[PDB]
Amino acid sequence: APVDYRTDPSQYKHWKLSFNGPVATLGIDIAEDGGIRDGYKLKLNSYDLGVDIELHDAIQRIRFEHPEVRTVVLTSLKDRVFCSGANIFMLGLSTHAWKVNFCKFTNETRNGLEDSSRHSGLKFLAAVNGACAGGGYELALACDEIYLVDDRSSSVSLPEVPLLGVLPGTGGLTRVTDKRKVRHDRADIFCTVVEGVRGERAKAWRLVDEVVKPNQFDQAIQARALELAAQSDRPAHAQGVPLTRIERTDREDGLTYKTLDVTIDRAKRIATFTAKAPQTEPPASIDAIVAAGANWWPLKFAREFDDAILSMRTNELAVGTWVFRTEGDARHLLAADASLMQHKDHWFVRETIGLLRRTLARIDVSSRSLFALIEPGSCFAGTFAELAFAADRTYMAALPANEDEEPAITLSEVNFGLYPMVTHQSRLARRFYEETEPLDAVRSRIGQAIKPVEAERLGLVTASPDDIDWADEIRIALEERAAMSPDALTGLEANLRFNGPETMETRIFGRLTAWQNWIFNRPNAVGEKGALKVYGKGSKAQFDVSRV
Amino acid sequence: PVDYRTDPSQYKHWKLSFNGPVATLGIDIAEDGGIRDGYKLKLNSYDLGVDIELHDAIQRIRFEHPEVRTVVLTSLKDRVFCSGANIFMLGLSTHAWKVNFCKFTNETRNGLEDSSRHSGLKFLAAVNGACAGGGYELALACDEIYLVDDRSSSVSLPEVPLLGVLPGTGGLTRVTDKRKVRHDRADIFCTVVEGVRGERAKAWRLVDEVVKPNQFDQAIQARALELAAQSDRPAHAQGVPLTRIERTDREDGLTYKTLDVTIDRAKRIATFTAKAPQTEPPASIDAIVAAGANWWPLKFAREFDDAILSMRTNELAVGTWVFRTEGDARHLLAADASLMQHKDHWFVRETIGLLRRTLARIDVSSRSLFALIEPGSCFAGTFAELAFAADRTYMAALPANEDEEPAITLSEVNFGLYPMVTHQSRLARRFYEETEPLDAVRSRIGQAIKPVEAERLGLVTASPDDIDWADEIRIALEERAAMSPDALTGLEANLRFNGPETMETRIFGRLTAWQNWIFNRPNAVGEKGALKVYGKGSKAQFDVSRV
């Protein structure tokens, strides 16, 4: 069945949230009977996609509904286990595509903790009591600090290689090196043994930040939480903004939201996303923005778009091309952007910018081809122009015989750094290789309605076919997209979009994930006699011992 | 088994011509000269054997031709420059064969750029006919690309639409990182078979100049001379002949003058024992030049490169390499001192370059690497790189016997003379460029560091006592043989490359790992996949679903 990423705390099976002044406590309490797919139990706080769907929502709730909260303590509500990682039985029963989506989404949820540490005024403290293994340690890694109980029952481990024949692929290796700076040969030992590291050795090797005896642990966690809270600028007095349930109509051929249509052509294998500008001028003043809350256009659009991206990634694997279109009045988009820029220091506007940033950042790493079609009547302006700059190709409709009807691309300040991709660059900076001449040229033209011929001349679009050439040029490009191997297209896209600089996050989606994917498609890990499927059976996994 | 040793008298596929400062390297591939059976190499398409000759030819230019300053790469076939890796050969190759072929060919091309930076050479691709796929990937690694403007000859990367694979020999990474082709233009370029010709190829940044056929040869020679003026190579020096590499092929390994490889097939371990100069190597430049190919640092570099290539290619099930050393550290340090003192001399610089490129093959090899530092060893200077390249390094503590206890001795060469493909020294990578631990080891240059200090400084993984050594090392090796090789290679690709990325790490990382995933799936390699339908007049059958 299809996955629905919509949930709320009243529905959580796996997490408890509680609030005590500036400290939120997020308790891991996974329901063993609560698997999102069938055929497995989730024992010992092991997890699946459904657990992460709830985790993603819980962080969203803290971000938007709890402005007065400054630190989040992540802790287990189970005896003897913090988190035992991605459920091995679940992995063994999953298709290749399901695993790859599961890795990608869980990676984005974790990247999101760090995103909020940078940009939301939040800090995350992992309070680790009991076994913290594999994905358990990968989650702790994404926190700002990790405190470990100093007793025999408490350890950190990454048993994936020796136990499962796979990597710590939820960013584990990349955080061990890039974030913790664990010396690589020590990391090798850590990643090639099942028995966990404890106490002062874990701290000495840089795997955790502090270790505390059991009788002092709770007090130490709370005191550190308050120290981390002092780093924040979040308000001492503010009511939160409830994230109301997203209204969505599911159709055989797509999805309907207030701010977004998705229409699927199953024969052509194309999903067309039509993003819709604010229907009326959005509020300029902070009091009206806050009062609008989840009905404030930039937040509403971010939420609906994120839901659509996640739904289509997960539930529509054969529909390999996404087309981006827009409709509405560019003046209302530009007014929205002006309010984002003016009020960007305000906690709520800042949080909303954060969700837009994270949501758009899902696009560049999605395994779908991306074409933006800038047709007459569209409104690729400001935030919406990011849909052009994210795309593999952008075509814009020239009308030599009817120039007054030509569409325009209109840049705003948001296109110059407000929504970095995971390379940390704006999409335009990536587009022009950070070259100052073409970037200066378009910066000079912020706010101008750039028409098709000029947009092509400035390099803002791939081509601007006229009304005679348009139909065939776009149809043929889309036919070719459907006819080529999806494997080759996704690989090509992963290299062309990430056209130079690397960061911890590009390494997570690149070097780490691509190696994991190759491992995931081979019998040593996933075969009937492989490491995942023999787990718990008392038998020896059979490996092809040859190197590649 | 593959033998990587060859020489110009044996070439089937290349012609070298020497005209003063300009060497012409002519592509003239023998259709019947495939290294494996079952395919012809038509229209200057290539296989591993073609690249083995190319690698040798560049080596000959480097060492035997101090007078050469520019290398013109061109085709001796009409109509075609190079049509890329042979598609029939790809369809007939195992997964492991393809992955090794991509890796070796990538290193050959990275080596052109390595010499452009460090040898005083420049490479000019004179593209005088169709230049497709691997053909364009080779041109990309040159310093400049000149395309004949003849209304026909084109550059193309048809791999995606035609083969269902990527331009995996650095093609995509050079298109973005080196040529700076706007990514959406690159997308068009990489998803059309016919490619691009004439002025548009220049405008899109795919080539540097286009010249009409009646002026082409003149323009190529003129530009070659201009690129030659940049060099400091000495026009009046004699070359150093690269004589044969003596090697005994045994059932259980390889014997070279400066290196033993011994294979334990049951344990799946190959032990490389590198040997120091047997006596003090020459300090003077004249004596170094007179020794030539027999000069220890060059001899060792060549033998070690041959062994790495041989073991990578011919011994797939032997997943762990153990590095040991033997001989006298004083002689190693004397060799290093000569390298540092004379590094501006063309021949010494060239030898440093081969050591650099050879060591740089280690970090990207799909084998686990353990360095064992035991009594009698000499992990000193250049040889200490074998410890710093390793996934783990164990050093034998002998608290009750100091004479027998080994030492690590650093020299200047450990601080940047031999960068891995991240551009870092192995020690800089090891310590995440942290100044405290690096200062602590640099200040001990030239000193014999004993096992306890070595472990405290973080230069080794562990220094086990002699009653703990046998079991600790044996268990680590048993575990290495028992774990999945797929997971180990992936692990090693992430832990060795522990932060910074470069164009070369992107070639071996982002680009190659995606290629490898594609290579292991039926859309590309299935009986009715893209490679195998080629030329058949049928349509590939694809699973259409994205991952």
Structure characterization notes:
The structure is a homodimer. Chain A is of the alpha/beta class and 548 residues long. The first copy, chain A, has 2 domains: 1-253 and 484-548, Alpha-Beta Complex (2-enoyl-CoA Hydratase, Chain A, domain 1), CATH 3.90.226.10; 254-483, Alpha-Beta Complex (2-enoyl-CoA Hydratase, Chain A, domain 1), CATH 3.90.226.10. Helices cover 41% and strands 16% of the residues of chain A. In chain A, strands 12-13-14-15-16-17-19 form a 7-stranded mixed sheet, sandwiched between helices. In chain A, strands 1-2-4-7-9-11 form a 6-stranded mixed sheet, with helices on both faces. Chain A has a 3-stranded parallel sheet with strand order 5-8-10, covered by helices on one side. Chain A is globular and about 80 Å long. Chains A and B meet through helix 3, helix 5, helix 6, helix 7 and helix 19 of A and helix 3, helix 5, helix 6, helix 7 and helix 18 of B. It is classed as lyase. The entry lists the keywords lyase, ring cleaving, burkholderia xenovorans LB400 crotonase. It forms a dimeric assembly. The entry is titled "BoxC crystal structure". Chains A, B: benzoyl-COA-dihydrodiol lyase.
